[PDB]
């Protein structure tokens, strides 16, 4: 929510249910994948991603 936080780049959310334990990752536009493990680390990392 922040102090008015919003998209600075287009943002691609891909969602698929699976019986396997929760996992999220991300992709930077310099052809770098990153492992986020459980999706608690998502919210901050996807703002941090856009910034760079």
């Amino acid at each position: 929510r922040g102090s008015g936080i919003v998209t600075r780049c287009p943002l691609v959310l891909k969602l698929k249910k699976q019986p396997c334990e929760a996992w999220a990752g991300r992709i930077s536009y310099r052809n770098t994948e990153l492992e986020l493990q459980d999706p608690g680390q998502v919210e901050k990392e996807i703002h941090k991603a856009q910034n760079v």
Binding site: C20, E21, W23, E35, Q37
Partner: protein, 51 residues
């Protein structure tokens, strides 16, 4: 140890990779095992036990 290494384990277990003669795991033998050059009977005994 981590969820990171347990995911790789799940992905190899189900054979998503092509290899028709498949996968396997061996222990590497420890740092103390290499120091003394211990008998292979103990390496067999150790290996079977750890898995």
């Amino acid at each position: 140890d981590r969820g990171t290494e347990k995911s790789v384990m799940n992905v190899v277990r189900n054979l998503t990779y092509p290899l028709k003669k498949g996968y396997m795991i061996v222990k590497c033998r420890g740092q103390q095992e290499i120091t003394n050059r211990l008998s292979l009977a103990e390496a067999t005994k150790k290996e079977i036990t750890f898995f």
